[PDB]
Amino acid sequence: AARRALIVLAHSEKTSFNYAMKEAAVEALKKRGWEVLESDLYAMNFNPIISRNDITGELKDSKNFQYPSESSLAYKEGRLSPDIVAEHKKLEAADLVIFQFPLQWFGVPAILKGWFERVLVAGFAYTYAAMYDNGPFQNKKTLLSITTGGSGSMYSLQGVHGDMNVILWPIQSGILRFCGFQVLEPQLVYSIGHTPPDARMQILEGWKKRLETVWEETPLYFAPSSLFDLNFQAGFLLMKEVQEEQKKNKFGLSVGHHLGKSIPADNQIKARK
Amino acid sequence: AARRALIVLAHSEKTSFNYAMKEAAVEALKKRGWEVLESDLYAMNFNPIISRNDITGELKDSKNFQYPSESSLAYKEGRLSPDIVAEHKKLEAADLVIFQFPLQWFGVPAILKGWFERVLVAGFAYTYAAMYDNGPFQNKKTLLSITTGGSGSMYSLQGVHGDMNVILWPIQSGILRFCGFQVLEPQLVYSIGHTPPDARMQILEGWKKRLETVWEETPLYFAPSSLFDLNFQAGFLLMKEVQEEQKKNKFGLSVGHHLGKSIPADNQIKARK
Ligand SMILES: Cc1cc2nc3c(=O)[nH]c(=O)nc-3n(C[C@H](O)[C@H](O)[C@H](O)COP(=O)(O)OP(=O)(O)OC[C@H]3O[C@@H](n4cnc5c(N)ncnc54)[C@H](O)[C@@H]3O)c2cc1C
Numbered sequence: 001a002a003r004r005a006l007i008v009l010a011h012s013e014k015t016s017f018n019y020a021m022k023e024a025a026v027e028a029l030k031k032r033g034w035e036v037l038e039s040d041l042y043a044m045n046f047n048p049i050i051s052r053n054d055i056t057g058e059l060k061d062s063k064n065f066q067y068p069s070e071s072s073l074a075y076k077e078g079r080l081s082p083d084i085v086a087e088h089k090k091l092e093a094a095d096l097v098i099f100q101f102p103l104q105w106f107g108v109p110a111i112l113k114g115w116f117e118r119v120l121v122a123g124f125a126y127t128y129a130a131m132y133d134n135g136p137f138q139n140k141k142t143l144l145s146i147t148t149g150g151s152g153s154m155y156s157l158q159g160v161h162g163d164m165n166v167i168l169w170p171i172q173s174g175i176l177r178f179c180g181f182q183v184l185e186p187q188l189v190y191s192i193g194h195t196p197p198d199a200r201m202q203i204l205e206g207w208k209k210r211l212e213t214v215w216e217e218t219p220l221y222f223a224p225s226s227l228f229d230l231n232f233q234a235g236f237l238l239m240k241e242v243q244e245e246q247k248k249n250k251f252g253l254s255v256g257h258h259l260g261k262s263i264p265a266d267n268q269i270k271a272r273k
Numbered sequence: 274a275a276r277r278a279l280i281v282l283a284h285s286e287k288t289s290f291n292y293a294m295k296e297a298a299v300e301a302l303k304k305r306g307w308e309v310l311e312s313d314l315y316a317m318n319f320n321p322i323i324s325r326n327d328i329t330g331e332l333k334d335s336k337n338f339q340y341p342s343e344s345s346l347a348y349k350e351g352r353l354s355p356d357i358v359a360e361h362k363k364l365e366a367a368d369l370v371i372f373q374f375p376l377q378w379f380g381v382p383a384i385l386k387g388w389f390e391r392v393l394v395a396g397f398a399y400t401y402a403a404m405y406d407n408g409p410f411q412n413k414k415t416l417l418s419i420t421t422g423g424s425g426s427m428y429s430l431q432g433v434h435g436d437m438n439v440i441l442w443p444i445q446s447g448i449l450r451f452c453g454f455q456v457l458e459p460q461l462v463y464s465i466g467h468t469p470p471d472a473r474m475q476i477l478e479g480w481k482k483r484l485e486t487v488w489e490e491t492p493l494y495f496a497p498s499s500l501f502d503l504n505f506q507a508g509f510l511l512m513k514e515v516q517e518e519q520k521k522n523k524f525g526l527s528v529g530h531h532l533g534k535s536i537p538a539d540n541q542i543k544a545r546k
């Protein structure tokens with residue numbers, strides 16, 4: 001059941017808790033006989049910006065340059081930048097992809113974003129035909145390990161910043177679910193700048209221990225594609241019948257599919273129903 | 274009433290609609306006697322990645338390096354990287370900041386995100402004391418001009434991707450409202466790869482015309498800070514009384530503050546109530 005796992009880290013300092021959280025996981029997975037691959041973006045000095053350099057050879061139409069087309073084509077033609085391929089080879093091998101990073105401006109780190117924008121190529125990572133539960137990565141599992149500066153309360157429903165589930169949605173459903181991944185519960189660590197030395201260790205211990213059975217956890221619930229007429233005809237809308245039935249439901253499905261009703265609960269924070 | 278405006282563009286090609294949308298705005302504001310400043314990030318070859326190079330001189334504690342502290346301090350001590358200050362000077366002058374960019378992975382472009390993470394320094398852009406409607410930029414107005422590859426329907430409540438409002442929330446409330454900005458209605462252009470030549474022009478015309486009166490539009494509604502006990506004591510929670518009262522309300526306040534109830538409407542797309 002256990003095999004290869006990819007750990008993507010987005011942090012410049014080796015003295016950070018984010019780096020700790022990194023080694024911990026690596027150390028953990030290894031003991032359980034896994035095979036860990038790493039993409040320490042800051043270390044690799046990975047390139048975040050997307051440009052016509054990601055492609056090799058004739059640019060087809062270098063006049064009215066368009067990245068989406070130029071790249072998915074470069075992909076099939078195997079003319080993609082070597083540093084971008086390097087990653088694909090890793091993704092192709094990883095069964096479990098883990099993203100370690102400090103929450104920055106309600107989102108993912110610039111350098112990480114770029115990895116998404118550059119690595120997750122159309123044709124490889126996704127296709128209008130192969131979206132969400134049809135995505136290419138449906139056999140792989142992924143989760144987010146985040147480090148927050150603010151406090152847990154700040155993200156509660158009555159907190160200043162608002163529901164944390166909303167924040168994760170764009171990342172978990174928008175990028176990972178999109179591509180096909182099975183999104184597991186996110187590892188949330190609030191304000192480590194406030195947590196004392198003890199807790200920090202117990203947190204690393206909890207981390208390690210949670211990894212002993214990551215592969216056996218249930219994924220987060222995202223609205224299944226079946227509920228939609230996935231065609232440019234219907235406009236990719238929730239099927240009339242499904243809308244019909246859903247009318248009898250008091251709750252929405254997921255954060256993005258609240259359907260105007262009350263949003264479930266920790267739909268994006270806890271895996272269950 | 275009219276004066277300086279900053280336009281930040283995140284697009285590599287000068288042949289893109291996003292570039293069109295950019296000149297249009299510039300051209301428009303200028304006719305109305307504005308003074309336009311620009312930060313074509315790809316052009317400027319702006320640096321997106323955040324690291325200890327953004328600081329000049331002695332790094333205080335270059336042992337357990339921590340970017341939040343090291344930077345806000347470099348800010349006050351005027352020891353910030355020159356390219357980062359260049360922007361600050363622009364922000365300080367701009368009355369209206371407009372962000373033009375193609376939606377990428379349900380978010381902002383890597384290079385743009387970096388600008389956020391690097392330019393919006395603590396002490397200048399925000400402070401735990403000065404957040405949201407207390408933010409430093411409360412006198413400036415901002416809006417997002419986005420270009421989507423997918424179709425409008427795809428983002429509807431019954432669409433594959435889900436409510437568009439959720440997507441914008443992290444950006445509009447999380448970054449812009451946070452810092453103090455008055456967030457105006459976002460300029461949404463869905464799938465221009467499908468819109469015909471005509472529409473494209475009319476869209477640019479609409480754009481132009483909408484700018485003749487941007488400064489007079491009403492901002493989007495975000496839950497006012499007054500509703501919270503903004504202190505590390507209470508944990509920045511919605512005041513008990515406010516919770517009390519809010520109990521009689523059927524709808525939540527904003528996307529992030531849905532308070533478990535039904536989310537208003539185009540709280541993030543249309544400015545009104
Ligand atoms: C541009 C930007 C935007 C941001 N936006 C947000 C935001 O929107 N919301 C928010 O909440 N926060 C935000 N932050 C703050 C950020 O989330 C925190 O600074 C970050 O998560 C802290 O994690 P870290 O791994 O860097 O750890 P560090 O700051 O280094 O802190 C780790 C702490 O644990 C100690 N430690 C390190 N290694 C170990 C180990 N192995 N064992 C035990 N103890 C150890 C360290 O000494 C230190 O006290 C932002 C920061 C930046 C720069």
Ligand SMILES: Cc1cc2nc3c(=O)[nH]c(=O)nc-3n(C[C@H](O)[C@H](O)[C@H](O)COP(=O)(O)OP(=O)(O)OC[C@H]3O[C@@H](n4cnc5c(N)ncnc54)[C@H](O)[C@@H]3O)c2cc1C
Nearest residue numbers: 117288289290291293375376377378379420421422423473
């Ligand atoms: C990494 C990545 C992630 C993405 N993620 C998403 C996503 O999550 N959701 C999504 O919906 N899309 C996504 N996209 C697609 C992206 O949103 C579109 O490719 C982009 O918005 C198109 O805008 P553009 O300005 O580049 O225009 P272009 O692709 O260049 O297209 C402009 C069109 O208008 C024409 N045109 C150009 N200038 C003018 C002018 N002055 N007057 C009249 N016509 C003109 C052009 O000939 C062309 O047909 C992603 C793309 C990438 C590369």
